[PDB]
C-alpha cells in the first residue's frame, strides 16, 4: 500500500506546496494605505461600468 499511496500523495503535496507558497507570499504582500472614500469612488466607477463584486465595506486602516 506504500507504492500507490505515495503516487497519490505527490500531486497533493505539489498542490499544497503551491497553496502555502501563495499563503506565505500573501502574508508579505503589502496593502496600500489609502483613504476609504477614494476606494469607494473607485468601486462606484466599477458599478457604473456594470460590474458586480464592487461591494463597499467599511474597514478601519491602521496608521
Amino acid at each position: 500500500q506504500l507504492l500507490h499511496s505515495q503516487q497519490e500523495l505527490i500531486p497533493r503535496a505539489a498542490q499544497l506546496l503551491l497553496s502555502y507558497y501563495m499563503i506565505r507570499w500573501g502574508s508579505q504582500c503589502l496593502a496600500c494605505a489609502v483613504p476609504v472614500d477614494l476606494l469607494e469612488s473607485n468601486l462606484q466607477h466599477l458599478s457604473v461600468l456594470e460590474l458586480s463584486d464592487s461591494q463597499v465595506e467599511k474597514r478601519r486602516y491602521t496608521s
Binding site: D37, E40, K58
Partner: protein, 82 residues
C-alpha cells in the same frame, strides 16, 4: 382616533413636519443658549469629517426638503406616490 382616519391626515402630516422644524429650531436655540452649539466641532460620517453644526443645518435643510416633498406629493400625486 385612527380606525380609517379623518379628513385632515395630509394636514396632520404637514403640521407634524412643521412641529419637526419648530423642534429643530428650539434645539438649535437651546444649544446656542447653553453654549453647546459653539462646542460643536466634528463627527465621523461615511469616512468624512463633518462639523455637527453643519450636520444640524443639513437636518433642517432636509426637513424643509421633506416639507416641500409633501407639497409635491400633493400637487403631482401619481408619479410621486409611485
Amino acid at each position: 382616533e385612527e380606525a380609517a382616519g379623518f379628513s385632515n391626515t395630509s394636514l396632520i402630516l404637514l403640521h407634524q413636519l412643521e412641529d419637526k422644524m419648530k423642534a429643530h429650531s428650539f434645539f438649535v436655540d437651546f444649544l446656542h443658549q447653553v453654549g453647546l452649539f459653539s462646542r460643536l466641532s466634528t463627527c465621523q460620517t461615511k469616512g468624512m469629517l463633518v462639523a455637527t453644526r453643519l450636520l444640524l443645518s443639513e437636518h433642517a435643510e432636509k426637513l424643509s426638503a421633506a416639507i416641500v416633498l409633501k407639497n409635491h406629493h400633493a400637487k403631482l400625486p401619481v408619479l410621486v406616490n409611485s
